[PDB]
Please model this.
Amino acid sequence: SMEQVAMELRLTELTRLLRSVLDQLQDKDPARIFAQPVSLKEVPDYLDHIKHPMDFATMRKRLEAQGYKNLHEFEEDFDLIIDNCMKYNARDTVFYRAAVRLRDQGGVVLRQARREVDSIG
Model:
């Protein structure tokens, strides 16, 4: 149908906007602490602590399959990255501190993303 196509064009354009959002958020992680999944070879107990691991490469795979239907879903995954780190790592660690800075800096980006998603529809 033509309606299915229009819907698919809308998902494609959201994917475009989320890709640019993703790039902006990942620039706020210049140390690349959140770039890849925590290694279960190097942290064998990780899944006993963290039930839903997340990282920027895993988001990018979901994104490119057009697997985010709305901004809320994308933000859920970004919050997992931050929140998982803040639980597993103590306050005095470079990892925890990196997550705090990513959260604070990402907030600005996500604020305008929401406006753009509503504005363009």
